[PDB]
Design a protein around this ligand. Structure first.
Ligand SMILES: [Cl-]
Length: 143
């Protein structure tokens, strides 16, 4: 039909419990990221949609890294690495910024939109005390 949405599928394990930011789309485009990291793993994730933060997922012991996107800036590619749990995330923006988090070891993955000229609209995944898995949802913005 007319829709340009696409979904990467889940990268990582089947552990933990599912989360989805699908209901956060209405708040706005992604405008900021919070990624909690310890020495080995991605511990936790929060994403700001417009002005409103998602409900935090993951554990709380770790360095809380945060990146604030520039006005009009979107993510167009996400890569990373996992081994048992998520270990590395790289958010690539349409302003050419490569926003890396975590430690550079594990099985690699690389997710780009399945329809051209769409951007990262929200994320889903699985979590517990760590981030077990992540999935990327792409769409046009504005809608
Ligand atoms: Cl694994």
């Amino acid at each position: 039909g007319a829709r340009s949405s696409s979904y990467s599928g889940e990268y990582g394990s089947g552990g933990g419990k599912r989360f989805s930011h699908s209901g956060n789309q209405l708040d706005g485009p992604i405008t900021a990221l919070r990624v909690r990291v310890n020495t080995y793993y991605i511990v936790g994730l929060q994403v700001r949609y417009g002005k409103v933060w998602s409900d935090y997922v993951g554990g709380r012991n770790g360095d809380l890294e945060e990146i604030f996107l520039h006005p009009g800036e979107s993510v167009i590619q996400v890569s990373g690495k996992y081994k048992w749990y998520l270990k590395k995330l790289v958010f690539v923006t349409d302003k050419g910024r490569y926003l890396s988090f975590g430690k550079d070891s594990g099985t690699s993955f690389n997710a780009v939109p399945l329809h051209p000229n769409t951007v990262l609209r929200f994320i889903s995944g699985r979590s517990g005390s760590l981030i077990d898995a992540i999935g990327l949802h792409w769409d046009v913005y504005p809608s």
